[PDB]
Design a protein around this ligand. Structure first.
Ligand code: QBQ
Ligand code: QBQ
Ligand code: QBQ
Ligand code: QBQ
Ligand code: ZN
Ligand code: ZN
Ligand code: ZN
Ligand code: ZN
Ligand code: ZN
Ligand code: ZN
Ligand code: ZN
Ligand code: ZN
Ligand code: ZN
Ligand code: ZN
Lengths: 191, 191, 186, 189, 191, 188, 190, 191, 192, 190
């Protein structure tokens, strides 16, 4: 995984590349508004890709509780901010997660923290959706998991096709959410 | 800026984007990243295409004599710009109003003037002033009012991480600045 | 109209051929005629006169307060590209004792909207027609429209809306009358 | 192609000038002077779709993401032209598909909409054409396309029904054969 | 009077039966058998305001509450009949008044609306009649009445404009003479 | 017919004049002077549908588009007249069918039956049967949602009450999944 | 109940309301409370007017032969009732659906049946069942579905004080009870 | 004051039992058995404001925060009883005040609403009482109170006007004398 | 169960701990705004945990009627205010309850009062949801019970993940609500 | 406040929270409460992190010369604070407007100034004033306007228990206070 030492070491290389981009765009990197931009853009890009340095074990912090619960738990409307790996422009939206506990429940915030491990990377929405579902499955081993991601890709609104209102909806269903249609429909209506 | 400048600077932009991918700990050779230095460079060139535009070419002599001396408004113009401090988008709406001096501007040219200045590395306050000044210079009307409302992704997906924050800026010239009733009317007609 | 119909159909058939289309296809067989009839309907306002439209609908109701007819659906044609511009018209007026038939305000909108237009002109024409037909203390007309030339083409700005207004008499000279009208139409 | 456009532009402008005269208008007045040309260029833009090929539009944007679950791109703004009256019909396209391991690049679904919407159309045909284009480009497990549109021919003339909306759909593969897949797509849009 | 209603009911039923025959319909079919009577009774109910007097409606509901501030009763559902085509016009009435120490019973404002709306009307007349009735019944510092209505003569026939709404108003006393009182009333009703 | 309309307009106007007098009103006052004729013309317009035939309305607008999937035209504004009280009932019509008819013809079929003295249940069935007879499709579904002014401005005086009626023919009646797909696609 | 019963019981109702005003520490002689024993008694008599009604008189023979065998719904019927436990209102909407057996009922008569039972001292569950049973007895249709959604003021301005709380009750008879597809179609259409 | 409730409870229950008999009901049926007592307790709760004093309610919650600017507590749910029919009238209270350096604890504005709303009322009186109680408890530069309510006497009986809402207001001090203060308060209370 | 004597005895222990918190945060417990805070915070925490002091029997008050009702009764949008047991920060939302009476019906307000027994405690949402459904099944013995809780956890919005719009939805289905899918879907659509 | 103060005071906060769990009648040894004294103490430190912040460090020299003399507004800034009277949150939105004196501030610094004062034990009126004064001192503009709209949980989940009540406070400095037209323009734009 990526480290804070890797971030400090790579920051001047990122700043050098951003300064080179400003010059290549016809801009003056010495004007007041651009003076600190190579560094602020480099730090922003490091923050946008901070998920690479995260591990599921550290994120969970042993937040698995024995609540004798065998019914669907949903955490919906998790704000998600990711980066398109094809154009390096953001894609933002919401993540809705549902799961069937096998007696043990995961701490509610850990579902949002798992979203943050994978969303803070250079992504493709389909991959991001699958990774979240698989992480929950491996961390807790529940009866089933369901993940739905709804996002606006800025590559499709401020450029290219320039379709203003287009939204991409992806889903990943594991266990009972995949095998039992009634579980799957209940999750989709509750979100 | 020119199209020759774009062709010449494209490989330098692609080189800097490839360097960024390596500095972030990513593999520039994986399927999803193979064409990214080029697609990211082309996207950044499109986002900064306003530098190569001139008001005269954009207007195309669209000034008509309609014996009109009353406020004309073009509201809800979708605007997509790039924060010059972090190189992350800031997007929103532009609302333009003007009092013609017998002659009217072609409706679309107001949105095209927005595109000259929004497709640049910007600060919202500057973008707002530039649009109002361009309209005043192109038409010489009794007055111009420009209101920009935008979401800065630098404030939502990083830093302060304030989800719902919106920045509202305005520039009032001529009668819109000197006459309070004119400014009061424009502001009500745009909501 | 009857004499012009075959000339319009001939021009529309010529357009179909110039676009690379087969004017003989089942779907395009009656298109030169349906397109010509549609364009005649879209421009029917040229053949209308204010006097015939009013039909003597002026009533003596001893009214000296603002009457508003808002949300009148308006469908016009951009004279620059020949593509529609559609929206709403909001009309207000201050009668001079005599009130006008409510539908006649919408019928005045139809005289000028069913023409090749520019929104600023259309707005002025409606206000002037009301002033000439009734001679009231004042008239106010607000038009809010979507120009398809700006949404399906050119700038391709999906949510842009154009707002125009024409204030005559008391609506122009008295700011309080003007602001009351603007709040009552929202 | 672009060569055909330049050659046919003066013939389109001549026909539009003829229309202005036949409507009782003055083609020499300020507002109408450039109209035969602007109207001809607009009609050529509205009919771009004819000169486009699926292969060029896709640009090899097919990625191996080991995905076998429904992908939806909804609320794609669509602007088309009624072939019966030559008046626009505008709305939204909602596309869903069940990939077979490989995923098409999201924008290419919106670009496929543009190939067939920028033509003289009938909504039912446009709906089928998008669904078929996706099936042919990707060969997925299934495709679902829903188009919801306002026909200006029904709002500004004829029946003059202001609020009427036409909803069409085309379901191929698993979207047609499996009722549960089809209902899931319809609720997610 | 109720004596006038009993006496005129068979004449109304005879005219409605005559209408059914003149429209090409069969007045003897099951659906139309009782229609001349049900239509006549409905028309008598729609015009019941003619048999009402302000004094009877008021029922001495004037209380001494030492109140000199604006009282508003808004969103009063109003159903009237167009006198030009005999088709309904329906909407809302918003009434405001500045008491002169004495306050009218809230329901009596709606009952005054019913005296004038249940008649063959013109919206401008109906608005004035309500304001004048309140001024005569109470003698307050001022009265304001705003009527917003959909005329079915404009939606299901003639111009056939579906969304058109007619807004009329009558301001008496302080509501007419003091602009600030008038604007306060207009903002408090636009809920 | 139009000759029937010219012959019956004076009688309608005399019956309306008689109504104005029987209500205690003055048919000689300015507001009422032209009302007998204008109310008569309005009632004729509201009952226009009886003079219309499906064949004339269709205008041969049947196209071969090789379509076997559901086509829906929803939110068609409908204005009808209650046959029990002669007061309007207004709302929306949502039509679905499995083929190809010209889209506007569905709204024109609504106008044939809505412009008559009606009962909502009858109006709904007539629209569905007219489409089935004109096209012979796999199935038709018609949903009418209306406000009856007889129930809001008089009688029970229930302000927000709405009546929903439906008619399902062919596959829309026999196949549960086709009817449930149509019912979800008409929700706006 | 009858109108003669209302004239006879009116002074006893007014006496009880006057007694309530005195027991609350109020002055029944002050301007605002002077006519209150009578206006409160008349209001309570109007709120309980459903006791003096009969299904047969309210239907007024409004049964038409329209050859209809498909679902008819009258939704959003405003309903105002009185809680029999605290004598405080419970108000909301009634949504009625039915599958005719060729014959249709007059639209307003469904709302009039709601008025027979809502204008009484009630419990929402009883009110819901009574409306469904009255329609079944008046029409004998294939099935009836009734859904009542109400705000009980006893739960918002007093007691538990949960002001967004809404009670939803339902009664399904015939095909609405036995056929799940009929039941779900009715619930989505309302 | 609490002793008055225990002493008067059997007299209230006797009057409610008498009402049940006079309505033609059986006071001995299961649903009506505890009703004379539950109705009496409910009426005592609805009129509990009579036993409250401003001094006890305030609990010395006056803080010195050097504040001289408008403080607003809007959307206070209010439940009162119509003194004419003994049927509820419910709505919202929006209070504004200009402090004279000292600020009242926010909750005490809602508690002042409860002193006067829990009584047999007239909306105009209730509005004035709240404003006068605040003016007396703090002696601020000015007070503004707006009450918006639905009278059940007007919806489930009498005029039977479903959507009618009564809006009353009381402005004291600067809120009454300064029009700009008054309009600022009225705009800030719109939600 | 907790008692009023327990509350009086522990109130000065709670104020002492709150006063200690004010000092440990670097604040001045003697400034005007903080002077009564140890007591007001202690009383508030006692109110937030009053459900421990309550028993189902006292709460019901014999409001179990004998109607002839065998159809679904729903009480939805019950405002619920609870306290996260992990951080001692509120979690607030709505509770929607549905049940199938076995002829006997419960008093409507008692469903909301059962919500109050368990929500006014240091909780976990999944536990709170189950306790409400189990209390209803034990008090009434109906054909089935369904409970849905939708809440905003302030630990998730004003700190930690800081996800502004995140909502947690939990459910507990007993009897016919668990075993019959049609009953379950009807309840879920009627609560929207 | 400092990071050393936080490390030193964390065990004292945990001790007080453990003492609160015992005083409420709870079992501090049960699974769900075992780490609570520490998680509650860390949460309270985070809620009060504003005490360790200085306007100078927060600004980071983000003052730009953009020749701007017109109103800049940053609205809908989500704000989370703590009631100093009950130690229960009060949350809402902050809307800030200012008239620059040629120099503009970095947009995010307005939200960061909100965070200095909201992350403390507060009173809404003080929070609003502190926010407007910090902007005036940092930039010296022509005027500043701050509006705070909040839900106090002390008033919704306890005490008066008024569900929908919202507190609106404002602070206007400079031209926002002295020019009524500037003040009204700001209030409509937010
Ligand atoms: N007036 C104005 N301000 C603008 C933009 C665009 C950006 N900015 C603002 O420039 C500042 C740069 O600050 P900095 O050097 O401290 O960076 P950094 O530590 O990464 O900051 P932060 O984001 O707080 O983490 C920020 O305050 C940012 O918001 C605009 O349009 N108008
Ligand atoms: N199925 C159906 N029913 C319809 C219409 C239109 C109307 N009706 C209903 O005929 C009944 C006639 O009753 P009646 O003779 O007793 O009239 P009247 O005393 O004035 O009654 P009311 O209105 O209660 O005061 C009413 O119930 C009315 O609603 C329709 O479309 N479909
Ligand atoms: N200003 C004011 N007025 C109020 C209340 C509360 C009630 N009222 C009004 O007292 C009047 C009592 O009249 P009355 O004697 O004629 O009764 P009744 O025949 O049953 O009447 P009605 O209702 O028409 O059937 C009504 O007008 C009612 O609205 C309030 O808060 N402020
Ligand atoms: N199923 C059903 N139940 C109904 C009504 C109407 C009321 N009720 C419920 O009877 C119960 C009475 O209990 P009780 O004797 O203890 O009274 P009281 O202490 O004042 O109660 P509370 O309000 O908690 O303070 C309450 O639960 C009430 O809501 C209905 O329509 N259906
Ligand atoms: Zn991209
Ligand atoms: Zn930035
Ligand atoms: Zn154009
Ligand atoms: Zn067409
Ligand atoms: Zn009319
Ligand atoms: Zn009727
Ligand atoms: Zn009750
Ligand atoms: Zn009353
Ligand atoms: Zn927590
Ligand atoms: Zn507090």
């Amino acid at each position: 995984p990526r480290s804070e030492e890797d971030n400090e070491l790579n920051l001047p290389n990122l700043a050098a590349a951003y300064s080179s981009i400003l010059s290549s765009l016809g801009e003056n990197p010495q004007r007041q508004g651009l003076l600190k931009t190579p560094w602020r853009a480099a730090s922003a890009m490091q923050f946008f890709t901070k998920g690479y340095q995260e591990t599921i074990s550290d994120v969970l912090n042993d937040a698995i509780f024995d609540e004798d619960h065998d019914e669907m738990v949903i955490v919906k409307d998790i704000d998600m901010f990711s980066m398109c790996e094809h154009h390096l422009v953001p894609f933002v939206g919401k993540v809705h997660i549902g799961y069937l506990p096998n007696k043990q429940v995961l701490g509610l915030s850990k579902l949002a923290r798992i979203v943050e491990i994978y969303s803070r990377r250079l992504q493709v929405q389909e991959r991001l959706t699958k990774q979240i579902a698989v992480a929950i499955t491996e961390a807790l081993r529940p009866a089933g998991v369901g993940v739905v991601v709804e996002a606006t890709h800025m590559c499709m609104v401020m450029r290219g096709v320039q379709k203003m209102n287009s939204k991409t909806v992806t889903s990943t269903m594991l266990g009972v959410f995949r095998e039992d249609p009634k579980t799957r429909e209940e999750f989709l209506t509750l979100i």
